[PDB]
Amino acid sequence: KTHVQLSLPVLQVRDVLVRGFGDSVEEVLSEARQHLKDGTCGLVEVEKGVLPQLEQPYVFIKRSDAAPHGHVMVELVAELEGIQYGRSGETLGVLVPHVGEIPVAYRKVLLRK
């Protein structure tokens, strides 16, 4: 399928134990895709002071379109020192490994695989 329905646990930044996916733009996008597929990927909603508490490079989910089955359509954009790899809509948040942290919510999304 070109798209995959996912239910992302929404984590508080201060609960996150592993604060990024790795050390290169291409690695974090690869790791983010592997965690999404294995159901081990969390989502931190971006506000004032959130990104400084996370590790670069960042992986964002951004709105790719304006919502099948209640799932917002999104795609991955990585960022490293102010430069984004990919082009998309509004940020829904930043992806991180999930290692069993208790979420505050779930975000239903349709990821463009």
Residue ranges of domains in the chain, CATH in brackets:
3-112 (2.30.30)
Give the residue carrying structure tokens 């990927």.
41
Distance CA 63, CA 82 (A): 19
Strands 72-80 and 105-112, how do they pair? Answer: parallel
**Resolution reading in Å:** 2.0
CA distances from 7 to 29, 38, 72 (A): 18, 12, 11
Phi, psi for residue 87 in degrees, rounded to 5: -140, 120
Strand, helix or coil for residue 28: helix
Backbone dihedral angles phi then psi of residue 57, each to the nearest 5 degrees: -65, 145
Which residue reads 């102010």 in tokens? 82
* Structure token pair of residue 51: 């990104």
Q: Identify how the structure was determined.
A: X-ray
Q: What 3-state DSSP class applies to 1?
A: coil
Please check whether residue 108 is in contact with residue 70, taking contact to mean a CB–CB distance below 8 angstroms. Answer: yes
Nearest to 112 by CA among 75, 87, 85, 77: 75
